[PDB]
Design a protein around this ligand. Sequence first.
Ligand code: NAG
Ligand code: NAG
Lengths: 533, 535
Amino acid sequence: EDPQLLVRVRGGQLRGIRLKAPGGPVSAFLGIPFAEPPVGSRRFMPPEPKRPWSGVLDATTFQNVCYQYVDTLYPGFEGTEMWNPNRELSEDCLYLNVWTPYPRPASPTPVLIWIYGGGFYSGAASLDVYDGRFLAQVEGAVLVSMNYRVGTFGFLALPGSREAPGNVGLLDQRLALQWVQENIAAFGGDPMSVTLFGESAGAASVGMHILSLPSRSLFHRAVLQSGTPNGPWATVSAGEARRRATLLARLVGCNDTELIACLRTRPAQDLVDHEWHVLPQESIFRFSFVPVVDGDFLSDTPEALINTGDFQDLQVLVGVVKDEGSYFLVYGVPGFSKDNESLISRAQFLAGVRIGVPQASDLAAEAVVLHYTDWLHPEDPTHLRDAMSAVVGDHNVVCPVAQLAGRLAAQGARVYAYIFEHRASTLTWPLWMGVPHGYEIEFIFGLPLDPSLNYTTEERIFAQRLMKYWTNFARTGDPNDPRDSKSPQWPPYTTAAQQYVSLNLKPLEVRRGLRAQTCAFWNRFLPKLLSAT
Amino acid sequence: EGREDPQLLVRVRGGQLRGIRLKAPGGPVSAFLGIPFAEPPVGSRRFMPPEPKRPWSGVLDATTFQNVCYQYVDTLYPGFEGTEMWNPNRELSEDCLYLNVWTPYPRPASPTPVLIWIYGGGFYSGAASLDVYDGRFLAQVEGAVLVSMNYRVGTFGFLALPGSREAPGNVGLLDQRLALQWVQENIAAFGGDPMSVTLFGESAGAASVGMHILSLPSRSLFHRAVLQSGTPNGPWATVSAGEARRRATLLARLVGCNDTELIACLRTRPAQDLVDHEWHVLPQESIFRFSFVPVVDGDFLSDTPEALINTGDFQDLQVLVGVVKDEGSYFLVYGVPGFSKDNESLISRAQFLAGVRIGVPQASDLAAEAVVLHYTDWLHPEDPTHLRDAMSAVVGDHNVVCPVAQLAGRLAAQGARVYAYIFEHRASTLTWPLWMGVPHGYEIEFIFGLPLDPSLNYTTEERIFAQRLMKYWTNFARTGDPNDPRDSKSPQWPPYTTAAQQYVSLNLKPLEVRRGLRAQTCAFWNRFLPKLLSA
Ligand SMILES: *[C@@H]1O[C@H](CO)[C@@H](O)[C@H](O)[C@H]1NC(C)=O
Ligand SMILES: *[C@@H]1O[C@H](CO)[C@@H](O)[C@H](O)[C@H]1NC(C)=O
């Protein structure tokens, strides 16, 4: 009975398991319950804290993945399967995982908390790309990740109802945050230094915790990778949430109480079977059940809240990958496949824009097409294909991020910004997608440090830099190596200079303006064009 | 005659003329100045189409420039060379329909290709007697036959009550056309070839050339065309019948006045009264907008230039078109608040947004925001230096560069052989501030070969640059191709095409081919904007 792998939290005792990291062992405590299972009549409900348990809870394996849609686009293909559930699906999924150094940290170690993405309809803390052993071993970090309910189970709301209030998936995340405050010290973590980080919907979730007062007392810094609370896909209005809820009730044969009761009696998979059929138009990068502006968790829209918020003692690191948009195109944009080079016609390009900006009037769609056309080569399919990707990435990630960065900087926050431009040598997607949404994660978690994975040696040294930036930021709110001259320095992002850095195999390069002209189009012009139809 | 120079006596359809032997750096030229080509458009003929000049008796002296067409005189900067060089340099008069001819001396052996200059000046000003329009250098150095005419400007040239008999509109254009006919009938007497006539002009001169291309009756009077910094399409060169009627009647009101009775009253007002009120009839505070311009009458212009270029066949047509680097700067100092020739005109963002409302007077609030968003440098949105240059670019792009881009595109796509350039050399002798760069109108002195006059103080490289230009221009007149058939060592100037969109730069360095004439931005103006303000 190894004492290092024994811990006492408020609910009782846990036994973790010693794991092998390339350069040493780490303590891992997997599958810790932080809430009463959200099953039966608890479905759609805010989480309750897990009840105490007798004896020693075996905490040595990953628990169930939250019930969610499973991808079929490219069955067997690693590039998609790597995102699929790698454990059994269950509504009983409210568990977190903790990795520490082995032996346990002598003094209180900064805590990093990972929040996975997946459009708010999928994701699991157990995926290999989120393996915390590397940062724990190498940077001596204490790392936490949780599951939170997705799709209908986490975000289906009948706003104002008692039995489907909305945002329960975010409440799951908040509950795990509180658990970390109350328990992390037992593991050698510092509850007074907690950094959230996440990607895609995970980044947006972090963003929402920034924008929701009750969450604020639970962390000190935030890292948002390729996702924001603001923007087209991350939130919906109370009205539109009510709309999608009842339409789904209808699709499954169903006053709120009555409706919600009948929904609670449907097998999980019946709900998932119609998840995708409540969307108001044909679209990409749009998801059926996501956080809802309820005047509660979110008191106003994210855009309102970031405009008027005070972000004084906040430090935030934000960034995007070189090709945010490409991944989404193969999911139903006519012309795109991972198999051909998806060179497209001008006709397909226009068609793709109606889908990419589902909310756009004819005139607005025209404006997008004109802005993104290369008038020197208005009909070259390589340009058209790339352009289609940029529309999607820019509309949904880059410009929302540029927007957020500016507002936080302007309003007191210390902001650091990056763009990730290195395509992994082991990447299974076609070259034309470049560096897609999701593919910086393996580097930040340090997977290339595992030799059996067959990353080049440069990628290994890269991974080490990234882990150092992230953990430095975690320790100090500044990504820069606190004793190290010349890189040169990573400068803060400010509305004036608008400096950000390029993360790739070459040393840090400071650039100015994150797509400034194009984000002006998306952030400043398009809105006028639509709020005037 | 008897003791007169025998090579300066020439007969034309209306009578005998005596010309003058002028000095040019490389030798003498024959000049015939102030040849009347129309009945004085005075009295009951004001606003009326020109009638051919009635034959005269004896030898008409053609040794000096004639009256300049009655017009507004610039007062912005008294005595300043930069403005004065464009001001009238002869007595103002409604009796002003005269043309000028320059030929080699003695006159050429075989029939020489003919160049015809049409001065610009917003359709409210201009004169063929200005120094920058001196044909003596092209005639001497290139052996060209060069012809320039006066045509009526302002109210006298363009005030229209469309439909009416006494003020049909476009008579200024008709003055121009009559001089073209005059050249057809008479230019052989000077050694000119009526079978080889090239039109060239600048600003409203260029738009004029454009309208002759779009007007059937003019089509048979010339073979090739050059448009410098101007087009028949675009926002300032024409008005609808409705708008011209409106401006015509508003002006009559302003001076104290059934169209017949209205026009009849106007014909009694002194020319100066008309000039003194012509700027007051514009719909909005604006730059690069003129009160009295060609009207779309379903006659001279059968439809809009925009329409006609979109649908006409231009198989048989060669055209050279271009722009200067800084088309807009000149206009900013005429009443965009913040700008002056005496300081750097560094402006504020507020002054930039105010300037945009003025430069795009037709623009709704949304359209003007679009313009400002497109032109703001979002890295330095407050930088007074980018704002000043952006303001100049807005004016230049909207009024010239994008209409010209649009024109070259449509013409090439429909038959024409098109050559395109941007002129980028600031004259060492320029009196305007550096911030203005290469302003509207400042290529002209090079094309006409002024730097060849030793007393002028141009640099030697400029003197050589001028010769290159005169060469491209005359080569195009002769052949429909600017390129020297001999010189293949020198880099070639390729036609402009929808496919490649190639054009050359014109500076002290050798020809450099570039691709895309402000393509992205011109998409904004030519494709997006029109659709926008249909809302
Ligand atoms: C330049 O001159 C004009 C007129 O005198 C003036 O209105 C403008 O403000 C001046 N610019 C500056 C900033 O000195
Ligand atoms: C050219 O330079 C000479 C020498 O100073 C000067 O006297 C003359 O006036 C100048 N001519 C012009 C046109 O400026």
